[PDB]
Amino acid sequence: AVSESQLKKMVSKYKYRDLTVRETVNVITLYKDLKPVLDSYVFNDGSSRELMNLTGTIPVPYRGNTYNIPICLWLLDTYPYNPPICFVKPTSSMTIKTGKHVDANGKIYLPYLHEWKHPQSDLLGLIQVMIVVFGDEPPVFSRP
Ligand SMILES: *SCc1c(C)c(OC)c(C)c[n+]1-c1nc2ccc(OC)nc2[nH]1
Numbered sequence: 001a002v003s004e005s006q007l008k009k010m011v012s013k014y015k016y017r018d019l020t021v022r023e024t025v026n027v028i029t030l031y032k033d034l035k036p037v038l039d040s041y042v043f044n045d046g047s048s049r050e051l052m053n054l055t056g057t058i059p060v061p062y063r064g065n066t067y068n069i070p071i072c073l074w075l076l077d078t079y080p081y082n083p084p085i086c087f088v089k090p091t092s093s094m095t096i097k098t099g100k101h102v103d104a105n106g107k108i109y110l111p112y113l114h115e116w117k118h119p120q121s122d123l124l125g126l127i128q129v130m131i132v133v134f135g136d137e138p139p140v141f142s143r144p
Contacts, residue, residue: 004025010050011052011075013049013050015078016080016081019080019119020080023080023122023123023124024036026124027054027124031127033057033059034056038050038051039051041074051075051077053073054072054073054123055073056070056071057069057070058071058127060135060138061135062141067142069140070089071089072087072089073123080119080123081118084123084126085107086107088140094143095140096139097141099137099139101139108130110126111133112126
């Protein structure tokens with residue numbers, strides 16, 4: 001379990017630890033389905049830095065059918081002035097259908113993000129928007 005005090009230690013490496021910590025509270029307090037976890041990251045330079053990431057699932061209604069989408073959010077050490085890179089966990093029956101916002105590596109582009117004024121949409125906005133911008137056309141789906 002991650003405590004808020006500990007949360008500071010976890011994102012102490014970032015330059016905006018206050019807004020991020022405060023903002024995460026909003027995300028895990030309202031979206032408890034998103035849990036923060038500490039992870040080790042290795043850069044090409046060989047230098048290592050401990051970064052915290054949000055990992056879990058988001059229930060999404062679709063065609064009367066609902067799927068449990070597993071997603072991992074990695075924050076850049078310069079977050080939130082830097083956009084967050086997202087990765088969608090694929091499976092044998094779930095594939096990535098490239099389209100208007102999904103590439104082949106699982107990158108997610110969202111118009112609200114390009115017009116997101118800091119701090120208005122906030123991370124919490126990204127998740128409900130994720131629930132909406134993916135409901136319009138699930139970039140991923142289960143194929144028998
Ligand atoms: S958020 C990715 C993830 C998940 C979902 C998970 O839960 C089933 C476990 C056990 C591990 N990871 C994950 N993927 C990683 C890539 C690199 C890294 O740094 C060493 N840590 C990762 N943890």
